[PDB]
Design a protein around this ligand. Structure first.
Ligand code: MG
Lengths: 71, 118, 88, 96, 275
RNA sequence: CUUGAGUGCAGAAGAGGAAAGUGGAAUUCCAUGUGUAGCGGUGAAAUGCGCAGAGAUAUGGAGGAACACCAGUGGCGAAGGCGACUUUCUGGUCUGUAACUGACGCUGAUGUGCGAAAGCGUGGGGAUCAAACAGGAUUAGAUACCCUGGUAGUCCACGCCGUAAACGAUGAGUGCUAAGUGUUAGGGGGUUUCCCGCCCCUUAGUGCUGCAGCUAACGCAUUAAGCACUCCGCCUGGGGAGUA
């Protein structure tokens, strides 16, 4: 309760964010390949997953951030 | 030219199914020059599934690849299979000068139903 | 939908006195407005489940509060059916 | 009455003049109907993570309108996909 | 919509016909009309060339401006009307200048809606303008193949073409019939599907209702005697003996191609799908 | 009369629903450039595709359907169900609050309506996947598994049927009775310079281990199969038969 990494990463984000205007919360929460870091890795709380998810997705159709970066 | 595209960096693309693996060496573009098939080299079926096929095919196209002549080459990798690791090794034995390997196992986002069976 | 502005307005005329917010008169009026709005949305979109469920809760409770104001009083009852023009 | 942002995206290959009359026109078509062009800016040139018609690279534009929900996107969506200069676009409400 | 008729007798059971909900008046403008005798499918001579026409009901010619020639000038729409000689219902158009001209009706047209004929007339339903300017991924009716004639294309009931893309000269288009053609960049056209969509769910219902139009009967070939048609003759009923089911005039029907491959537009034709 | 119920006021969240709009990968079909003799498949094979240059490789085009990570015993909803994103419309829930009406409540026969997938009509669409079917192989034989193709259909819209292991095989509602432990949205307070961090408490659903007790046993154990009340539905040996 809980065996994941630290509780309380969120101390530097909230209440509402991003939506696209902040790279400085953006790449922290994802990979280098393009996929997302799960909640096991980052140590964030649950709703922030459920926000930053849609944050990056809105960032993708505006092409601020790739669907894929393997090259 | 045109059949003899001489450069010092082209591309290699690789396949490896469970039952067959094909390799090819092309340009940066690419435009295609060589290939080899485990079945082409006499093997059949159950012996296409061998790691050694990676090697003898790797050589077997690498020769004509450096007949045109080439120093370096990139390596794409598809095909979850045995030989995706081995052909790299035996391709270094040819004496060529890979700089990077890109594993692109082509994954969809559920574009179509896969075969139910089994 | 409705929005608090409309709601907080119309109660002032039908509220039996000043501070009140209950006094079921209010409630059948407000619910009346709601069901009409949702009913026209519902004719726009013929097919749904959320709505008709929602209505029939509202209408169902409307009938009840009405059956309550049929016996706590009789004058308010007639007065409100002919004021709002609902429930023949 | 509710708070919309909007982003719109334009190619680089146009001449800078067309960008001017386009933008001013465009804040026009968000303005004309009673709904308020409030705070217009330009995040500007930037490279994309991937190409969208064929362009690696392109322009961005940010503006803002607070309005009723009946005046701005109803016109902009119509005048978005037909226009061969506005590439992509997306509109939201006040959430992050 | 189509209103089924309650069966009361034999000759109504499968019957069906239209509701006429897109109509405002019934009697037309006298002026634009123009008279029309009939021919019953036959020549300047008098001989029958096309079979089974004539027998029908009387009618007239409602004129149309398919050109949409006068450009720029905004218009309005103050009425609909009915048109026998085409499936597509028809609109009347008070131009700005007091002129009056009839136009085929796009689906979803509002009386009082306004519609233009110009280059700078930005896209809506109804507006008339060339192909070069239109965006890709749009449905369009009443294209001209040639500058200034009067359109020949998608002019019937229901939906219409698709623009797949364009060069500078010429311009592509996919039809219904799904088939492709290169079209000029400057031919005048418009946008929006055509009106009446359920003209085809009409179960005509009874024999007369072909005569009312009118058309008239067509007799089969395996019934006649063998002069008049090749299949004919035969004791009792008549399997078609020969292969290659024939017209009365030889010349098969069933699979044979009759496009003449020397025609000039055969380069413009690509990707023949329906024929 | 206010404690049940409902209305408020300030708030929290959500894959709750209907319609429209947008986008990337991927499969496929075709076109073009590159280039030769195999591809693909199996446990082993064969049938098929291919010198008309396949497959492989690169570019760009069309086209339908589904939406990698995220996703978790997580959430929502009355159930069936709902996972790309954005807008429009819109249903209910939980907390705190307590002014506000002052028992308006619970259950619910007959009726009325929503209801997986398959199925049916009418009309559109047709990329995969794939009943029926054909061929191959195995096999004593195989109209079955395996393999290569492959239509309806899957898909959309308006209608219709109206069922399931529709399952937790546990009716709804209220109330009382040991703890521990995680989790989800909230609320009060102490510590902290600031809790955002730590701790203690309290509501609502959510999972596991567990006593009292029950149960024939397995097991349930504040999300009862315990202690009781109300209301409804249902069973009276098995086959015959969910048949006539
Ligand atoms: Mg609890």
């Amino acid at each position: 309760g809980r065996r994941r990494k630290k509780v309380c990463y969120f101390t530097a984000n909230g209440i509402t964010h991003i939506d696209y205007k902040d790279t400085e919360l953006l790449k922290r929460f994802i990979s280098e390949r393009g996929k997302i870091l799960p909640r096991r890795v980052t140590g964030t709380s649950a709703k922030y997953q459920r926000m930053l998810t849609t944050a990056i997705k809105r960032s993708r159709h505006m092409a601020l951030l790739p669907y894929v970066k393997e090259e | 030219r045109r059949v003899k595209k001489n450069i010092e960096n082209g591309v290699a693309h690789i396949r490896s199914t469970f039952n067959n693996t094909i390799v090819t060496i092309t340009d940066e573009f690419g435009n295609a020059l060589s290939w080899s098939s485990a079945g082409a080299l006499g093997f059949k079926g159950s012996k296409k599934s061998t790691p050694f096929a990676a090697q003898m095919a790797s050589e077997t196209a690498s020769k004509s690849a450096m007949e045109h002549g080439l120093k370096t080459v990139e390596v794409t990798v598809k095909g979850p299979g045995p030989g995706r690791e081995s052909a790299i090794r035996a391709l270094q034995s040819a004496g060529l000068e890979v700089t990077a390997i890109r594993d692109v196992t082509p994954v969809p986002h559920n574009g179509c139903r896969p075969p139910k069976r089994r | 939908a409705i929005s608090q502005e409309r709601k907080n307005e119309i109660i002032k005329e039908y509220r039996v006195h000043e501070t009140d917010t209950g006094s079921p008169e209010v409630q059948i009026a407000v619910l009346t407005a709601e069901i009409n709005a949702v009913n026209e949305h519902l004719r726009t979109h013929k097919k749904d489940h959320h709505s008709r469920r929602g209505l029939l809760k509202m209408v169902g409770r409307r009938r009840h509060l009405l059956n309550y104001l049929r016996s706590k009083d009789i004058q308010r009852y007639r007065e409100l059916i002919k004021s709002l023009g609902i429930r023949r | 009455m509710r708070t919309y942002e909007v982003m719109y995206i334009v190619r680089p290959n146009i001449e800078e003049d067309a960008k001017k009359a386009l933008v001013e026109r465009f804040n026009g078509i968000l303005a004309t109907e009673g709904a308020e062009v409030l705070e217009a800016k330009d995040w500007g040139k930037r490279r994309l993570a991937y190409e969208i018609n064929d362009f690696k690279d392109g322009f961005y534009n940010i503006v803002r309108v607070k309005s009723d929900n009946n005046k701005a996107t109803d016109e902009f969506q119509r005048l978005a996909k037909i226009s061969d200069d506005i590439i992509r676009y997306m509109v939201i409400r006040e959430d992050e | 919509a189509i209103k089924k008729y309650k069966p009361i007798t034999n000759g109504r059971r499968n019957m069906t016909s239209l509701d006429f909900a897109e109509i405002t008046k019934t009697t037309p403008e006298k002026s634009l009309l123009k008279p029309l005798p009939k021919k019953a499918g036959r020549n300047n001579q008098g001989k029958l060339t096309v079979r089974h026409h004539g027998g029908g009901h009387k009618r007239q010619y409602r004129v149309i401006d398919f050109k949409r020639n006068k450009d720029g000038i905004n218009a309005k729409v103050d009425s609909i009307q009915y048109d026998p000689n085409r499936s597509a219902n028809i609109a009347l158009v008070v131009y700005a200048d007091g002129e009056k001209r009839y136009i085929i009706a796009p689906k979803g047209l509002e009386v009082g809606q306004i519609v233009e004929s110009g280059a700078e007339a930005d896209i809506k339903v109804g507006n008339a303008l060339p192909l070069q300017n239109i965006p890709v991924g749009t449905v369009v009716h009443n294209i001209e193949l040639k500058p200034g004639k009067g359109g020949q294309i998608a002019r019937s009931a229901g939906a219409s073409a698709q623009v797949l893309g364009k060069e500078g000269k010429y311009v592509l288009i996919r039809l219904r019939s799904g088939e492709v053609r290169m079209i000029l960049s400057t031919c005048r056209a418009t946008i929006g599907q055509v009106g009446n969509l359920q003209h085809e769910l009409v179960n005509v219902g009874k024999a007369g209702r072909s005569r009312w139009k009118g058309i008239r009967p067509t007799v089969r070939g395996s019934v006649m005697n063998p002069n008049d048609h090749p299949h004919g003759g035969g004791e009792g009923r008549a399997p078609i003996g020969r292969p290659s089911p024939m017209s009365p005039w030889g010349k098969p029907t069933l699979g044979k191609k009759t496009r003449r491959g020397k025609k000039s537009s055969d380069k413009l034709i690509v990707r023949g799908r329906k024929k």
